[PDB]
């Protein structure tokens, strides 16, 4: 693992300590603003469920993707920064995000 944001955060958040996760997205917004998405635009999820919601606005996100040579225990990631709408699946009470369906 290098020193880029992805290699470090994937490790710190317990994603690559015992495996190399192929892809992962980190959202750079307040927790409350992401939870607010559960009452925004209702859309179908990839699996066909209707408990997904798309954010009205784009959000700051960092995409982390394993390079072609990455191999446990030396996971390596390519970091890509972008601003896009997020789609999360929500459940429970309070109605909060439990899955990241995608980013547009």
């Amino acid at each position: 693992s290098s020193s880029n944001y992805c290699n470090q955060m994937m490790k710190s958040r317990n994603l690559t300590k015992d495996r190399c996760k192929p892809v992962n997205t980190f959202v750079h917004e307040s927790l409350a603003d992401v939870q607010a998405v559960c009452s925004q635009k209702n859309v179908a999820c990839k699996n066909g469920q209707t408990n997904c919601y798309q954010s009205y606005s784009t959000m700051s996100i960092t995409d982390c993707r394993e390079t072609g040579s990455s191999k446990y225990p030396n996971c390596a990631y390519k970091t890509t920064q972008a601003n896009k709408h997020i789609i999360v699946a929500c459940e429970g009470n309070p109605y909060v995000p439990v899955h990241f369906d995608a980013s547009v």
Binding site: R13, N24, F26, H28, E29, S30, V34, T62, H99, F100
Partner: peptide, 15 residues
């Protein structure tokens, strides 16, 4: 242990 909501925060949020 860790709820689905908490897992989502740990894996995807960086405020």
């Amino acid at each position: 242990k860790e709820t689905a909501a908490a897992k989502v925060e740990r894996q995807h949020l960086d405020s």
